[PDB]
Write a protein that binds this ligand. Structure first.
Ligand SMILES: CC(C)=CCC/C(C)=C/CC/C(C)=C\CC/C(C)=C\CC/C(C)=C\CC/C(C)=C\CC/C(C)=C\CC/C(C)=C\CC/C(C)=C\CC/C(C)=C\COP(=O)(O)O
Length: 374
């Protein structure tokens, strides 16, 4: 669900596309969509626009506000990219022609064997799940149902990697892939780690709060005393029960932790393990349909209903717990590397450590294949 429009400045005398002879657009990277719009205009309006190629949607927008072109094509996915450098962009423009487009996100792929990968995307926002934002949580869960082993692989939000699809395979912080869409995040991580991602789950703050509540809160073992959300919550060393608001604080805090984002990553992992413990309780398994009903409008997933039913019932019958291991991709913070989405800003990114990448990839393979972790 996205659209392409022809946009002009808010105060333009231009009312309709027939008044135009050309439009500025990034045909180098979004040509398929652009040509569809152009063919649509030629057929409904009998107007045949020439294209002034721009290097990107952002560059087109810049040309428009600089009075270097009268009109641009805007793909709605990229409004959220323009917004990164121009937060007021919406008030600067009007749209004079709009065409809706469609695309299904990731088809799920059923693993032929005992092992599958689920990508968990956590989005930086409250409200309706359809809201577009960056993906600040990016965790791969590798599950082997034969060995009963799960590996959580965390990739830091600032990891500097080639971003698939809308990212044009150019390097940027991983969290930006989320703005292009969940399929961009999925393909980005598939390419990084060389594995197929069978399924995804996408959720935001509002989704997470609901889930922890429905589960009765979660229990974790905390290793370091800390407080979260500007002091609102305090977590002592030891066994801690987390209600929903506490859990959200627990997975968001970074700066005061001994190891910063890495410790936050570990805290997120602790919460996942805790959620899994609740979801595999006999009560939760028996009442899985109620949980599906209670979360379906706030959590997106491509896990098929039949697959959920198989996973649940297998666990119901055989019982037995999964052993969970965790790992995180390591790197070095830098301020001097360019962001593809935000070419005018100096951003903090994490340059990936190649030795860590090799170890992380091998661990994913070991768990999938039923081999002991190194
Ligand atoms: C909807 C789902 C997936 C499940 C619900 C339905 C049920 C009952 C499922 C049961 C499945 C089951 C019982 C068994 C499945 C087979 C099995 C025994 C194991 C396999 C597990 C599997 C295949 C799927 C289960 C997936 C599970 C249980 C959990 C995935 C982890 C989840 C759902 C959430 C964790 C997300 C998290 C830790 C954080 C999200 C927080 C958010 C939204 C944002 C954080 C952003 C941030 C940290 C900072 C940004 O803020 P700032 O920095 O600006 O302050």
């Amino acid at each position: 669900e996205y659209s392409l429009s022809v946009a002009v400045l808010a105060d333009s005398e231009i009312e309709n596309v027939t008044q135009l002879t050309s439009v500025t657009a990034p045909t180098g990277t979004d040509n398929e969509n652009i040509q569809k719009l152009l063919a649509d205009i030629k057929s409904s309006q009998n107007t045949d626009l020439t294209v002034n190629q721009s290097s990107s949607y952002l560059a087109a927008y810049k040309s428009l506000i600089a009075g270097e072109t009268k009109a641009i094509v805007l793909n709605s996915v990229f409004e959220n990219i323009i917004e990164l450098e121009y937060p007021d962009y919406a008030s600067k423009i009007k749209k004079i022609y709009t065409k809706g487009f469609t695309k299904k996100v990731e088809a799920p792929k059923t693993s032929k064997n005992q092992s599958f990968n689920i990508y968990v995307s956590g989005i930086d926002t409250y409200g309706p799940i359809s809201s577009v934002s960056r993906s600040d949580v990016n965790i791969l869960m590798t599950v082997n149902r034969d060995t009963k082993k799960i590996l959580l692989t965390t990739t830091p939000r600032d990891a500097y990697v080639p971003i698939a699809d809308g990212g044009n395979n150019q390097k940027d912080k991983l969290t930006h892939a989320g703005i292009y869409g969940v399929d961009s995040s999925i393909h980005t991580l598939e390419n990084l780690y060389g594995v197929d991602i069978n399924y995804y789950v996408r959720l935001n703050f509002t989704s997470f709060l609901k889930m922890i509540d429905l589960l009765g809160g979660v229990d974790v073992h905390n290793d370091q005393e800390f407080s979260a959300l500007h002091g609102k919550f305090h977590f002592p060393v030891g066994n801690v029960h987390l209600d929903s608001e506490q859990a959200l604080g627990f997975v968001r805090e970074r700066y005061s932790l001994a190891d910063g984002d890495r410790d936050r990553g570990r805290n997120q992992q602790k919460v996942i393990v805790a959620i899994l413990q609740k979801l595999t309780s006999t009560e939760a398994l028996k009442n899985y349909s109620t949980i599906i009903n209670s979360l379906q409008d706030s959590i997106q997933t491509n896990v098929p209903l039949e697959t959920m039913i198989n996973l649940v019932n297998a666990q119901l019958e055989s019982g037995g717990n999964y052993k969970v291991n965790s790992q995180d991709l390591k790197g070095t913070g830098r301020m001097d590397l360019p962001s593809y989405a935000m070419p005018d800003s100096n951003l903090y990114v994490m340059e990936i450590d190649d030795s860590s990448l090799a170890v992380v990839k091998a661990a994913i393979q070991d768990v999938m294949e039923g081999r002991k972790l190194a």
